[PDB]
Design an enzyme around this catalytic site. Sequence first.
Site, mmCIF file in Angstrom:
data_model
loop_
_atom_site.group_PDB
_atom_site.id
_atom_site.type_symbol
_atom_site.label_atom_id
_atom_site.label_comp_id
_atom_site.label_asym_id
_atom_site.label_seq_id
_atom_site.Cartn_x
_atom_site.Cartn_y
_atom_site.Cartn_z
ATOM 1 N N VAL A 124 -5.007 -8.017 -8.364
ATOM 2 C CA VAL A 124 -5.530 -6.866 -7.571
ATOM 3 C C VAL A 124 -4.864 -5.667 -8.331
ATOM 4 O O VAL A 124 -3.715 -5.300 -8.264
ATOM 5 C CB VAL A 124 -5.358 -6.885 -6.082
ATOM 6 N N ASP B 269 -6.862 -18.163 4.566
ATOM 7 C CA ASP B 269 -5.414 -18.050 4.277
ATOM 8 C C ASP B 269 -5.169 -16.424 4.516
ATOM 9 O O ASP B 269 -4.663 -15.816 3.788
ATOM 10 C CB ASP B 269 -5.767 -17.914 2.747
HETATM 11 C C1 BYP Z 1 6.162 -3.416 -0.682
HETATM 12 N N1 BYP Z 1 5.305 -2.404 -2.096
HETATM 13 C C2 BYP Z 1 5.746 -3.232 -3.231
HETATM 14 C C3 BYP Z 1 3.845 -2.588 -1.778
HETATM 15 C C4 BYP Z 1 3.216 -4.085 -1.625
HETATM 16 O O1 BYP Z 1 3.194 -4.756 -0.588
HETATM 17 C C5 BYP Z 1 1.543 -3.866 -2.197
HETATM 18 O O2 BYP Z 1 1.365 -2.519 -1.381
HETATM 19 C C6 BYP Z 1 -0.312 -2.370 -1.200
HETATM 20 C C7 BYP Z 1 -0.877 -1.252 -1.323
HETATM 21 C C8 BYP Z 1 -2.197 -0.995 -1.249
HETATM 22 C C9 BYP Z 1 -3.169 -1.929 -0.931
HETATM 23 N N2 BYP Z 1 -4.593 -2.014 -0.702
HETATM 24 C C10 BYP Z 1 -5.605 -2.672 -0.799
HETATM 25 N N3 BYP Z 1 -6.830 -2.197 -0.464
HETATM 26 C C11 BYP Z 1 -7.996 -3.002 -0.695
HETATM 27 C C12 BYP Z 1 -7.670 -4.310 -1.087
HETATM 28 BR BR1 BYP Z 1 -9.189 -5.582 -1.005
HETATM 29 C C13 BYP Z 1 -6.636 -4.871 -1.443
HETATM 30 N N4 BYP Z 1 -6.273 -6.173 -1.595
HETATM 31 C C14 BYP Z 1 -5.095 -6.965 -1.852
HETATM 32 C C15 BYP Z 1 -5.189 -8.329 -1.339
HETATM 33 C C16 BYP Z 1 -3.716 -9.208 -1.519
HETATM 34 C C17 BYP Z 1 -2.882 -8.940 -2.272
HETATM 35 C C18 BYP Z 1 -2.892 -7.432 -2.795
HETATM 36 C C19 BYP Z 1 -3.979 -6.418 -2.363
HETATM 37 N N5 BYP Z 1 -5.350 -3.991 -1.169
HETATM 38 C C20 BYP Z 1 -2.501 -3.510 -0.687
HETATM 39 C C21 BYP Z 1 -1.153 -3.471 -1.142
#
Ligand code: BYP
EC number: 2.7.11.22
Length: 283
Positions: free
Chosen positions: A18, A119
């Site tokens: 993603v 999930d």
């Molecule tokens: C701690 N740090 C490294 C950050 C991590 O947790 C990651 O941070 C983030 C920051 C923004 C988002 N936005 C986001 N928006 C729409 C969708 Br559809 C989506 N899907 C998604 C599904 C599974 C795993 C990862 C993403 N994520 C997601 C994770």
Amino acid sequence: MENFQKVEKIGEGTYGVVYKARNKLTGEVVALKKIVPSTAIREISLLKELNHPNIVKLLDVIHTENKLYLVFEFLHQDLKKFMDASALTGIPLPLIKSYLFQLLQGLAFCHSHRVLHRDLKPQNLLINTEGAIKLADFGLARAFGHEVVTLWYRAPEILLGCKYYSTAVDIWSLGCIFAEMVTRRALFPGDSEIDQLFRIFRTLGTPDEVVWPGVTSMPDYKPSFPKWARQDFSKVVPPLDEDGRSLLSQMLHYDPNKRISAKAALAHPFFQDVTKPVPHLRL
Ligand SMILES: CN(C)C[C@@H](O)COc1ccc(Nc2ncc(Br)c(Nc3ccccc3)n2)cc1
């Protein structure tokens, strides 16, 4: 894909990666997931009409070069990061309740349409600055099918080999997440299927025909399973008031048929005073 510019990898979902990306034409910022059976395409297409304020909107599906890309609305942060950021002080109960209430609303909607997640986990629960929380990757598991996949939120019936599980599996996962938000520690952090199963048994007691009719006939059930006694919820989730503990216990019932539904959970006393606080997000 020529219409998208990758900004950053925001996660390694179970099936595909993603990315945060921008539409070269509209300038729109979105979440792009790179995952092909014709059945998959059709199933994904149905998910496009499954719209609800608590479900991450699937904007478009791009199938090019035997490749599949899913374009989703972009949310600000995931629940796992928010939980880690709130570990020192803990997420305010009012916010935990608001989040649980909204997720139950989202599940009620999906479940009313015979669609389940399969999930649920902190990593696919997304939040924004307005206080909303949304379910992501909904219905994908039924569409498709080296980071280790977490088993922490898996319902016991799945672990025991049930081939045709129900909407109840989502309620179980949400219950585990609910507990985690409250205690700031995973409820059943198993590192293998049997360890996951036994961790559940050690806390809720080894299931038998009394609390779960038909369990001893499940595919992976073993008469040799150790027999642990059930623990009091006051010990499992101390911080949670009795209303919350009552609701949690019904979300964690062993028998999937006895497990509370999302719709019934919404009418539980615990939500009598639900509100919609705004989280303190560091973006
Ligand atoms: C701690 N740090 C490294 C950050 C991590 O947790 C990651 O941070 C983030 C920051 C923004 C988002 N936005 C986001 N928006 C729409 C969708 Br559809 C989506 N899907 C998604 C599904 C599974 C795993 C990862 C993403 N994520 C997601 C994770």
